[PDB]
Ligand binder design. Structure first.
Ligand SMILES: COc1ccc(-c2c(Nc3ccccn3)[nH]c3c(C4=CCCCC4)c(-c4ccccc4)nn3c2=O)cc1
Ligand SMILES: COc1ccc(-c2c(Nc3ccccn3)[nH]c3c(C4=CCCCC4)c(-c4ccccc4)nn3c2=O)cc1
Ligand SMILES: C[S@@+](CC[C@H](N)C(=O)[O-])C[C@H]1O[C@@H](n2cnc3c(N)ncnc32)[C@H](O)[C@@H]1O
Ligand SMILES: C[S@@+](CC[C@H](N)C(=O)[O-])C[C@H]1O[C@@H](n2cnc3c(N)ncnc32)[C@H](O)[C@@H]1O
Ligand SMILES: [Cl-]
Ligand SMILES: [Cl-]
Ligand SMILES: [Cl-]
Ligand SMILES: [Cl-]
Lengths: 382, 382
């Protein structure tokens, strides 16, 4: 119908090779933070057949056993046997980690008061919130994440023992306009691809994916006789994980955020401590956006911030409310400036960003879940 | 003023470590395509001190000397001596490349007519165009790219011989609304950080960056006494390239596209042949968007497509014109469907995507430059 449109988002499972890397990078970060809350961490992970490589820069007082940390993360994901294509017990773990560049350290944080630490890099970051779900997230990405979580649940509980950890999902929703906001109408198309054992047949998989995965996740009111299902569309997915496709940290940044809604500034989250504004300022911007929506000021909002390396205050803060506020964007920006301090050395205090909770963020999206500090709205004064 | 806002985009130079990886990945792709136009290539590159690692999946009839291809790419970028932190002559080149998964091959392209080849993965992709510049790109990202290009020019011509290849820039523009379109007013803030030799002092660098870089790129009509300049804001950037910061392919996807404008579906471009719709469908979507703007149908437009692995036709196509067309989005979508075929096996023909031109795309953005096929608008019939 006129005024309607389709929009698609995707998500991936815990054993998707890029997500393996994000989780390992954040397991490394958490291990450092457990011993040194001020650790400077920039840990990239690369995964291919039989290999996890850590590359990057860490300056920390912690003593971290990288072999143990990496292998325990892979064990948790479920890659525990050569029959599955990857095994935490027997893979190669290679480490190419150096100290943080002293030139960066001197320009960012050396001899600086914590509240006045400089941004760890330049960059731009966005925060988004939408009233279309209680958790202020787009329905497309929420459903896509939940489909992957359901696969992992049914794998771990033994219901569908042919499942393996590598999966991808994609959800297309038909939306209608509503005064600048968007309203989901129906699910138009669902894709699910998941790695599987050599014995199970395609028809058994497709039936299970429809009846035990989709129907257990997606409300029936969104599904109808016209909904299109692409279930195991490649026909065979026995080879998977890093053996099927190289993984790298920071290659699922749209899955990690809003599924394509809002906007993205390009920076990856995993493997980075709070001085890297790619993560901390994106978390703070989500917190601002969600606070504006939960505060009743907007129904939908996009916030941009930006930084220069070594400079503590943002270079720019901007807000767009899609026509969903009675207040001008100028007024909302004044409210934001009166209620939030987006220096990284203040964000760290407000969002408790030295705490080792980051591995938990590294699958199923960083936003919309589990009442992390950036998901608890701030009560606004104005 | 009310109705105005700030917006920031960034770009990076040819020697930025992530961009080094993109360029190497596409040098590898081009080397394969020179000998085997049908090569299946998924080449990731990782860079750290003294190391280029290639990881991924290639099935090809070509005989490629990876040592030579990698080292020649690094030579071109300018890393030719240990004094600069990296040297093509003496770095380590490690290769962890396997064949493409046979399970992918059978589901995507084996025994398929070329026009009916399946998408090489699921995913979503966007194309964007804006009439604010002749090349239909946002001014923020165009200026940011041009600042990095100017640095490389002045490095290569010996004017500023203290420059090294690793650089980043960022441009904040004040915009005003214009009937759904956006109109740039002035440059609010510029950041430039660039790697340099041990001898040159900060004041010499800052003066040169203002007088010989910014003033040679940014029209004076956009600069005024209030413009803020953050030039070498870290104070020291002698350590750079992969030694200062690990690089990975596909970690500059917003730099590669629209600088944060429009939208992004998450997929990286470099190192991938045309069957990977992350690249080919994003290129085709840019071509659609630019064709609509150059055709006079819109002033600003965002196109989304999406795919399932193994399926040739897009699962969804959607268009949003920001209120800048007299035609409804429904009508524009009908025009697009009548004029474009977004199957990957047709895109390859329309955009000549077996030709080895990809290394040229891998710095300074994939869009808005050099009349690549996706930048030449299609004449639309309706
Ligand atoms: C008066 O009330 C409203 C409420 C919403 C909108 C609106 C909208 N209407 C629409 C109507 C018919 C057909 C297509 N579209 N379409 C979109 C999109 C897109 C949709 C499909 C392609 C891709 C971008 C987006 C968007 C999504 C992600 C990232 C960036 C932008 N926003 N958006 C909107 O706000 C307009 C007016
Ligand atoms: C009637 O004519 C128009 C023309 C343009 C707009 C408009 C707009 N007005 C605006 C006015 C005052 C203050 C802030 N904003 N602000 C934006 C933004 C953003 C701006 C700053 C934060 C981040 C997103 C974006 C956008 C950019 C990148 C990615 C996604 C969305 N689009 N956008 C628009 O279209 C509205 C009406
Ligand atoms: C399709 S692979 C990307 C293309 C691949 N690099 C190549 O060489 O063609 C991308 C992701 O899809 C999933 N995948 C891998 N093998 C697959 C298969 N046989 N069927 C469906 N999806 C698959 C995995 O999640 C993988 O990380
Ligand atoms: C600042 S580094 C990212 C943080 C880094 N990984 C760490 O360990 O803190 C990101 C990019 O900024 C640039 N960069 C590196 N050293 C820098 C310095 N001393 N001053 C300014 N920018 C620098 C390079 O382009 C590099 O790829
Ligand atoms: Cl992927
Ligand atoms: Cl949006
Ligand atoms: Cl970077
Ligand atoms: Cl935009």
């Amino acid at each position: 119908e006129e005024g309607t449109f389709l929009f698609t988002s995707e998500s991936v499972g815990e054993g998707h090779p890029d997500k393996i890397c994000d989780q390992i990078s954040d397991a490394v970060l958490d291990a450092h933070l457990q011993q040194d809350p001020d650790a400077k961490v920039a840990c990239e992970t690369v995964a291919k057949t039989g290999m996890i490589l850590l590359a990057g820069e860490i300056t920390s007082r912690a003593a971290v056993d990288y072999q143990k940390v990496v292998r325990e993360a892979v064990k948790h994901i479920g890659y525990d046997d050569s029959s599955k294509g990857f095994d935490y017990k027997t893979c190669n773990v290679l480490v190419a980690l150096e100290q943080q560049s002293p030139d960066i350290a001197q320009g960012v944080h050396l001899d600086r008061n914590e509240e006045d630490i400089g941004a760890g890099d330049q960059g731009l970051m966005f925060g988004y919130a939408t009233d279309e779900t209680e958790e202020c997230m787009p329905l497309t990405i929420v459903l896509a994440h939940k489909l992957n979580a359901k696969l992992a649940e049914l794998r771990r509980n033994g219901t569908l023992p042919w499942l393996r950890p590598d999966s991808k999902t994609q959800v297309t929703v038909q939306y209608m306009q509503d005064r600048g906001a968007v309203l989901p109408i129906r699910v138009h198309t669902i894709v699910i691809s998941v790695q599987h054992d050599e014995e199970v047949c395609l028809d058994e998989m497709r039936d299970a994916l429809k009846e035990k995965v989709i129907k257990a996740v997606v409300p029936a009111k969104y599904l109808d006789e016209d909904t299109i299902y692409h279930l195991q569309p490649s026909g065979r997915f026995v080879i998977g994980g890093p053996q099927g496709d190289a993984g790298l940290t920071g290659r699922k940044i749209i899955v990690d955020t809003y599924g394509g809604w809002g906007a993205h500034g390009g920076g990856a989250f995993s493997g980075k401590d709070y001085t890297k504004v790619d993560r901390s300022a994106a978390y703070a911007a989500r917190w601002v956006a969600k606070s504006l929506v939960k505060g009743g000021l907007c129904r939908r909002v996009l916030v941009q911030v930006s930084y220069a390396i070594g400079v503590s205050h943002p270079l720019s803060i901007s807000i767009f409310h899609y026509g969903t506020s009675q207040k001008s964007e100028r007024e909302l920006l004044e409210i934001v400036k009166k209620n939030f301090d987006l220096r990284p050395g203040v964000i760290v205090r407000d969002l408790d960003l030295k705490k080792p909770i980051y591995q938990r963020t590294a699958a199923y999206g960083h936003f919309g879940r589990d009442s992390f500090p950036w998901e608890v709205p701030k009560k606004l004064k104005y």
